[PDB]
Amino acid sequence: FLPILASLAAKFGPKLFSLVTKKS
């Protein structure tokens, strides 16, 4: 994945997004 987008995504919590594979 793109490093700037990954830097935002990792920082804002990918564990909550990944569990329903959807959150935001």
| Cα–Cα distance for residue pair 2/19, rounded to 1 Å | 21
Q: What is the experimental method?
A: NMR
Please identify which residue in the block is written with the tokens 């329903």. 20
**Pair 10, 1: CB distance under 8 Å:** no
**Per-residue buried b or exposed e for 9-22, using 16+ beta carbons within 10 Å of the residue's own CB:** eeeeeeeeeeeeee
CA distance 18 to 15: 5
Q: How many CA atoms lie within 13 A of 6 on its CB side?
A: 3
Task: Mark the breaks in the chain: residue after which each occurs, C to N over 2.5 Å.
Answer: none
Region of 13 please: left (phi>0), alpha (psi -120 to 50) or beta.
Answer: left
Beta-carbon contacts of 9 under 8 Å, excluding residues fewer than 6 positions away, are 1, 17
What element of type H or E holds 10? helix 3-11
Q: Which residues contact 11 (CB under 8 A, 6 or more apart)?
A: none
